[PDB]
Design a protein around this ligand. Structure first.
Ligand SMILES: CC(=O)N[C@@H]1[C@@H](O)[C@H](O[C@@H]2O[C@H](CO[C@]3(C(=O)O)C[C@H](O)[C@@H](NC(C)=O)[C@H]([C@H](O)[C@H](O)CO)O3)[C@H](O)[C@H](O)[C@H]2O)[C@@H](CO)O[C@H]1O
Ligand SMILES: CC(=O)N[C@@H]1[C@@H](O)[C@H](O[C@@H]2O[C@H](CO[C@]3(C(=O)O)C[C@H](O)[C@@H](NC(C)=O)[C@H]([C@H](O)[C@H](O)CO)O3)[C@H](O)[C@H](O)[C@H]2O)[C@@H](CO)O[C@H]1O
Lengths: 99, 49, 38, 286, 237, 286, 237, 237, 38
């Protein structure tokens, strides 16, 4: 189900359900991040897995995030999606997230 | 980088989805924090009339 | 259940059958692992 | 496709992949199918014999809990000069939000209902009387009593349960009694042949009326009596799961919505806001 | 191979060269009512080709600020062709539906439509305790539009609407969505004029956009009843 | 090495020993092993068939006792103008020293917990009311009620037990619910990814919250209600025994110590003093 | 079929939908050092997943007047992740490499990049008898650029550089190049800080060009060491 | 025969000619995590020789008025060699430990050190209700000292500390103590930076004494992780 | 146990297995009776 990644002031209704990316002028640009506690308020809370999981207290298992690109056919690009196991501060550069 | 020609929109959207795999498990049922009430819902008392 | 009506019995917590695919993959043509979906 | 699952699936060790024409991490959301990418195909995994059980999420257990469905307080006294020592309640599962939201996670439900009735009393001090109450089940729109002592309470055919406040809560099971094969949690239609009927209310889904009275005649002083009814579904079958309720409920008669004044759960924003899409809430500051 | 498809029922046929496989709601397929599930005892009429065929409804225009559209079944078809006649002359009806939503554009256009079939989509009204009225619900062939698609006009959410049978029309990928719907109800048959089993919802989660020549981009809905059966014959309502 | 022991070991008769190279009474404490000198090797013994049982020291029995873990008194009255007819207790086994010291004789423990709830009342005389109470189990840091009559008590999913003061104490079993294979009686670490977290407190070892309220509305007069909770572990598995606590406990949140003002159990001297190492206390003066 | 590809090593994976098969240098594949070829007698450490995974370097911008870029191995990775740590703590190392160069554009863009893996690419300096210095050669993660790509900065020629393992990224055809490199040396292992077995060179033989909207077109390099082995453990250099 | 011993792991070895047998905590021996007890599903890295080797910490001086010393594991080694690097780059770790405490003197010296490995040694603070802080607990390679060894700084007692895996170094008898520690935890793996499975405590129950030439008598600790496994790879913390 | 969950059962006081040596003699090389320990 859809994650509400764009949960920001100024984003209303369905605008909150999509993340806009633009042609960049700089390299290795950070586009967005997503907090991961399916048990707390955030992009993952109002999802099927989030809603049902919140009727429970303990959880275990792998999660899967699927992203669908909705630009035009003539649009191309490569993105890197990274999952960083806990321990430190959220990475802000590709060289770090890439690890 | 996202690269598009002149006639394509230069700002595009992604829709992210999430789900559990079948190696998932949930335990210890509790009331959900996603719903609550302070008063009687409209019409609740009318069920007694 | 000592009652004469079966609906009075205690709960039935033994149905472990599942079929997620009716919700996760309701596509007419099955999708093979690794192969391009389209 | 169907099978018996008693534990979460195991993980098999996986090796390096570099095969042309094979792209397990790519999918097509447009088909309507959920991604079938397995962990073993996304990364190198080890072997794991997973023993985690999956029984606490069985529908029977998920919905199998006695939840409050009715709470009614009234005055037990001489009503010479309002619920006069008794009340009538049209049974419904839409008044208390916790049970309602869970039932509404499904489109159709078939179940028997265990009913438990809890009674408490308070003096309006010389002690608490051990009163006898009568709870009579009166079918849909059927004839209900109009007085604490009307003849209707003779209950010749209606089922009645008499219980004392000093006894454990009364309990009994109402069978799955719908005229259909399952109750309609949601009903996109009108209950009548004319056009002025109520929308979304299928009469077939109303278990009935619960008429409760204090059997004892009034005492020289007044008391406040509260009756709480709990319902626990069992022998459950459920069909077509649905999107969970997000906006606060407004009425027991419909799905009308307004939303909270400010996020979370406001019509304009379900999730609370963060500064930006690159702002990590609860970021670890070591 | 799974991008091209031809649907043929009765005297009607439809092809698409840019499909995305197709959905069979809950993995089921329409069928006639078996004797062991039947209730009404009169011999039913099974019109076959006169009713089990594609009916194309009037198109709608996808605009930059559109909120979405919906069509309730069988209401949307209760006054179209022989399906409509059988519905008006019989107290009871039963059928599945083959849904095909169409929307093409340009390789320079972008947009994503969620095409979902919702069972028992009981609408809610906004900011009032008064329940929706007959005219708010029964729109017929024209269908209606979403006021707050974000919560599916029922206080829930479109985000989790994927739990229902669906497909998407993502312009850079496909130009049509196909969903096969079996009879969905708690009763073997029903009165077609007061209850809608399914609601077809088409919602633009990602708005239509482009920088090329602006053109009217329509969305068209074609629906074919399947395995129609009618009981309780009388005069037309 | 492992074996089944149901009685204390027997003694075998032994003879005179005078063997070169054999010195059973000599040992080497430095190895870390306890002396293996047998009575038969230290003195001349007779044969004894020992029938003394060893079951009362089984871990299951040693820890298998319902011990007081919580005691809370509050006023039941009109709180118009403090625990207002209800309270919330974050479950823990560190508040009462008798149970605490025994559990702390082990490093890790795995067990199910039988919970028994005892209620008593006293008038602040016209008799004692037979009140109905509700004890709702609310998971770790989860949402607890803020009023005696809040909607939270509808307990749609949380487990709730309703009981009367006139009934026997309420009882139920909470399963071993740790996210790990055993509870950590001691935890040499910090419960968070940052450095400011609490030391020695692993959240995984907190069974949860116990929310208790009087269901009845207040009476015209006030009463003092005391609720006592007892816990008895069962189906126990224990690992790595530890040095017993000697210094008085100071806090439920840590092992901080100070010691008594004077021996015994003072930081400077655990055992009470005797005049000298050649002074025999309680010497028999015949 | 030979245009789509997924590479997965350790906790990393990469897919491309516009590949051109892929190259296995000299038809070989990486492998661990066999006992009959071993020299160092201490038991080696084989980290596997912590080192045999994709490391993505900072991107570079393909400009109309670019001359080309190069990255030497293992130098480029000697300070990245656990591969870098093992390299710093051990006197000896050995490994193969899986190289994936990425560059996408538009169907209106043109350009051709030669992506070649050169063994022992000993650079020469231009118009001087003084040999290149340490800083002219060891660029690390940033890599360097070609001064005279026409002669591969070594007095030979790019024209004949195809004699080395390579692929091309011709924008109208593909958007990525993949080359698998086996251990290439005259010794079974080597000191990673003073000798580079391979040099990845990306050179625009046909410059980037288009008449559509101008955009920054990056070139990205992802490299995954394979079958890493380290010997001669000590402190970090 | 049980007084001489050689321990060899990786590129490290230690011998003692005055040992007292050696202790295997709870009669167990270190081992890798079996599939039937595993939780984290990513393939773990097993560095072997680069991490499973002896690390010698800075020595401490045994003085006439010393109260004792302690080192927590893995904290004491979280920043040493390749074990430290793997710990910093991975969210999860698992390992056993081979401990060797060294202290020699003279046949004219007397003294007895209790060398005990305490599982979950949760320290308590003295005369205050405030719990110990991060810096009171995490001393790293330097370790800490006992304030009140008599009660093991936790309100219990050193007298009964023999219930834990231990040995003694009684100068007239031996000059070293050896204890093998298996993974000790309620979980199969753990986050190394916030939880210490074991605490090595060395306490002089009988003070150092002699009437011969006074010399600095050091106590040295050498620790070798065993069967190290790491999961959850990312960047270094 | 008439309850459906096994953890609800009464106590289990029948495990008479013991192995004191894991605490009393955790030495790698067994110590023989009478023989000098060192
Ligand atoms: C209690 C705690 O540990 N921290 C509090 C902060 O979380 C809080 O900031 C707000 O937190 C909100 C949490 O989201 C929910 C939740 O409890 O998970 C989402 C629920 O769906 C929602 N339920 C309903 C029926 O609306 C629930 C509810 O609104 C609140 O419990 C009522 O207060 O919130 C959310 O993320 C907000 O956006 C965020 O600002 C701060 C506020 O000062 O207090 C902390 O103690
Ligand atoms: C009761 C009796 O028969 N004789 C009394 C003498 O024993 C007592 O002299 C003192 O006795 C002390 C006994 O030691 C303990 C015990 O009860 O065994 C040790 C316990 O660990 C300790 N408990 C705690 C929590 O501190 C306990 C406790 O301190 C006392 O019960 C409190 O008074 O004491 C000990 O040996 C003392 O050193 C000794 O002087 C005399 C004192 O006048 O009275 C006799 O009636």
């Amino acid at each position: 189900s859809m994650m509400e990644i764009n949960n920001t002031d100024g984003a209303n209704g369905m605008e909150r359900l999509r993340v806009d990316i633009s042609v960049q002028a700089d390299l290795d640009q950070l586009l967005f991040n997503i907090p991961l506690d399916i048990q707390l308020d955030g992009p993952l809370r109002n999802t099927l897995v989030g809603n049902i999981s919140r009727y429970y207290t303990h959880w275990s298992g792998s999660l899967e995030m699927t992203f669908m690109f909705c630009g035009s056919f003539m649009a191309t690009g490569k993105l890197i999606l990274c999952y960083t196991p806990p321990g430190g501060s959220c990475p802000t550069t590709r060289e770090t997230a890439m690890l | 980088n996202l690269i598009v020609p002149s006639e394509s929109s230069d700002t595009c959207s992604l829709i992210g989805f999430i789900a559990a795999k079948d190696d998932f498990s949930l335990r210890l049922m509790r009331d959900s924090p996603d719903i609550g009430q302070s008063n009687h819902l409209h019409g609740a008392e009318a069920a007694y009339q | 259940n000592f009652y004469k009506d079966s609906y009075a019995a205690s709960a039935s917590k033994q149905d472990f059958s599942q079929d997620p695919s009716k919700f996760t993959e309701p596509v007419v043509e099955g999708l093979k692992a690794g192969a391009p979906v389209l | 496709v169907e099978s018996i699952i008693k534990t979460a699936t195991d993980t098999v060790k996986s090796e390096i992949n570099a095969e042309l024409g094979v792209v397990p991490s790519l999918n097509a959301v447009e088909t309507g199918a959920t991604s079938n990418t397995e962990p073993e195909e996304a990364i190198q995994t080890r072997t794991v014999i997973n023993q985690h059980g999956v029984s606490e999420t069985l529908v029977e257990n998920f919905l199998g809990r006695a939840a409050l469905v009715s709470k009614k307080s009234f005055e037990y006294k001489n009503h010479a000069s309002t619920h006069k020592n008794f009340f009538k309640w049209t049974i419904n599962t839409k008044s208390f939000v916790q049970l309602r939201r869970k039932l509404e996670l499904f489109t159709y439900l078939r179940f028997d209902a265990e009913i438990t009735i809890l009674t408490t009393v308070a003096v309006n001090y010389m002690g608490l009387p051990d009163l006898t109450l009568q709870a009579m089940f009166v079918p849909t729109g059927a004839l209900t009593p109009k007085e604490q002592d009307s003849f209707h309470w003779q209950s010749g055919s209606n089922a009645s349960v008499f219980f004392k406040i000093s006894d454990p809560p009364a309990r009994m099971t109402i069978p799955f009694m719908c005229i259909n094969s399952a109750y309609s949690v949601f009903y996109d239609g009108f209950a009548g042949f004319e056009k002025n009927g109520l929308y979304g209310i299928n009469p077939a889904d109303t278990i009935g009326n619960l008429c409760v009275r204090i059997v004892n005649e009034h005492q020289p002083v007044g008391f406040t009596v509260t009756v709480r009814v709990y319902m626990k579904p069992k022998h459950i079958k459920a069909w077509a799961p649905r999107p969970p309720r997000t906006m606060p409920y407004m009425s027991i008669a419909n799905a009308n919505y307004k939303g909270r004044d400010t996020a979370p759960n406001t019509l304009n924003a379900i999730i609370g806001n963060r500064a930006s899409v690159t702002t990590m809430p609860h970021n670890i500051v070591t | 191979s799974d991008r091209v498809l031809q649907l043929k029922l009765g005297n009607s046929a439809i092809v698409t060269q840019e499909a995305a496989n197709y959905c069979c709601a809950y993995g089921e397929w329409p069928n006639y009512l078996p004797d062991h599930e039947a209730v009404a005892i009169d011999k039913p009429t099974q019109p076959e080709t006169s009713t089990d065929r594609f009916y194309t409804l009037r198109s709608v225009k996808w605009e930059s600020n559109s909120t979405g559209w919906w069509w309730k079944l069988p209401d949307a078809l209760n006054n179209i062709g022989m399906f409509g006649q059988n519905v008006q002359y019989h107290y009871l009806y039963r059928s599945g539906f083959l849904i095909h939503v169409q929307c093409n554009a340009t390789k320079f256009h972008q947009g994503a439509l969620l095409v979902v079939a919702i069972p028992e989509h009981q609408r809610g009204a906004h900011d009032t305790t008064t329940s929706p009225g007959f005219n708010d619900i029964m729109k017929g062939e024209r269908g209606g539009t979403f006021n707050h698609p974000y919560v599916l006009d029922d206080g829930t959410s479109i985000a989790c609407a994927t739990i229902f049978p669906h497909q998407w029309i993502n312009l850079r990928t496909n130009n049509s969505a196909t969903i096969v719907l079996p009879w969905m109800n708690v009763a073997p048959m029903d009165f077609p004029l007061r209850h809608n089993q399914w609601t077809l919802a088409v919602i633009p989660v990602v708005p239509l956009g482009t920088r090329t020549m602006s053109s009217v981009v329509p969305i068209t809905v074609s629906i074919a009843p399947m395995c129609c059966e009618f009981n309780g014959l009388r005069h037309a309502i």
